[model samples]
Target: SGAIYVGNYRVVNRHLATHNDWANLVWEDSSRDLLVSSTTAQGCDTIARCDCQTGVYYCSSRRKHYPVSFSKPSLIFVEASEYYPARYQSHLMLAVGHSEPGDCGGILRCQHGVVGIVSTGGNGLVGFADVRDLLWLDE
Candidate 1:
């Protein structure tokens, strides 16, 4: 319900960052080649697979991006205070109803409105992705 859109893919959870805080990370399944871009203001991203079965020289990756807000617990573990913007605080895999071009499929993490990673894919990277090599070394 509160997903960020970039052409085709959905934006997932990402750390706090101002515009151009750093370069945006993206992955392509086929080449299995990871990529980096620094354009958050103007979106230039998408996902396309040629079908690994009948396949697109393609693959997948996965990771769990957390929300900025923390655990709110009280009596049985219930605490309340503030909520993040509908955009940045969720595990939602929905679209924002934007007509953005289509980058990839599933959820993507965003930093300053930029695509960070593909959070919901099978054969892709996991955990923290290296900005330079797209290495899932931390996974």
Candidate 2:
């Protein structure tokens, strides 16, 4: 049992389960290899990325990780709308109030100074998929 303190939760092994279609499926989030805190601990996602639930404890071979803070507004919808062009608002809006297994997606700020969009789809989940091509004029 490795169960190292990757973040807030105690994780030994990690899995990236993907679901397709409108099929409701519940599984471990590879993105979250740690644990969702009571009020969230440390800095942001990088410290422990979770939907305030599924966390990542150990990720040896994974994609990019986001660090959206719990007490702050990293993914401001208004700014995101302009920066992201609101092109994917149909899906972007879903991320705001997503309360499902494979329907959780939203904006993320990185420790390396990068803003990304994490979205959930039929294939699975994807992060840092590009959204820096908008007018970005929203006050």
Candidate 3:
């Protein structure tokens, strides 16, 4: 029902306040609906804002979605030492995706912007390693 594109997009940091790692990018259409990308582990918590005019998407927390201007642009890690048992070596692919159920696919980019520690990894870490590309279908 929709068109899907495939390409590797570069990930960037849009907020630098909180230290919570990992995030998923989402966009809502004129119907006030949401389109979410795959989950990405940025190794930090970040805040992003959406462009109301152009419908351009950005990452933002629920508590700080107002004024738009007060929203931060870069992603940040709040507690680095809480998500990883040991320092993560580069080359590990982080997963990101939509939390809802629907399709509006797009390209996603991954980049190395910051580094920190995590304390949530031990012997219970369980999940897939690869993420699917975004899919945008026709209405």
Candidate 4:
């Protein structure tokens, strides 16, 4: 029951079907006793996880939603970031395949690291939040 509660909704589990989103609101918690958590490449109950080799630790955070991409419509994987690499304001990452409406907001992982957080996509592609762009809130 390691669930992060926000109002009445739960952050884990993909049950009790509902809508989803990409952007996340920063919820800063300054508790001194909060335990330090570790992430690792692991498996899940439903889909078999993605193997990104040992380049990074993408699904290390408890492996909430394993297999970066799911087969709701068809199977997929977290592919790349900055589809328009030269575009200055591009904060979205790209996936190798398609995703469902509820798939947004989920973390897009790769062995290289936490590539991005799912935002939106379809028609043979998906977009995610660039983890790098998410670090500025610390300022």
RMSD of each: 16.8, 15.1, 16.7, 13.3
Per-candidate clash tally: 26, 10, 43, 4
lDDT of 1 at 93: 28
Please report the candidate that would top TM-score against the real structure.
4
Which 10-residue span in candidate 1 carries the lowest summed lDDT? 50-59
Per-residue lDDT for 1-139 in model 4, tens only?
1222323222322221123311222232111101111123222312113333221112222444544442222122432343222222233445555556455545554544444445445686555444333333222
> What C-alpha lDDT, on a 0 to 100 scale, does residue 124 get in candidate 3?
24
> lDDT values of the candidates?
0.25, 0.25, 0.20, 0.34
In model 4, residue pairs whose N, Cα or C atoms come closer than 3 Å (at least 3 residues apart or on different chains), thus clashing, are: 39-60, 40-60, 56-111, 56-112
TM-score of each: 0.18, 0.21, 0.16, 0.35
lDDT against true structure, model 1: 0.25
Q: Report the alpha-carbon TM-score of model 3 versus the true structure.
A: 0.16
Off by over 4 Å in 4: 1-89, 136-139
Candidate 1, superposed: residue stretches over 4 Å from native: 1-29, 33-65, 68-104, 117-139
Worst 10 residues of 3 by lDDT: 112-121
Best by lDDT: 4
Model 1: per-residue Cα lDDT over 1-139, one tens digit each: 1223334232332322223323454432212112232333543443321111111111132222333211111111112213222222222122222211122332333332322332222222221111212223212
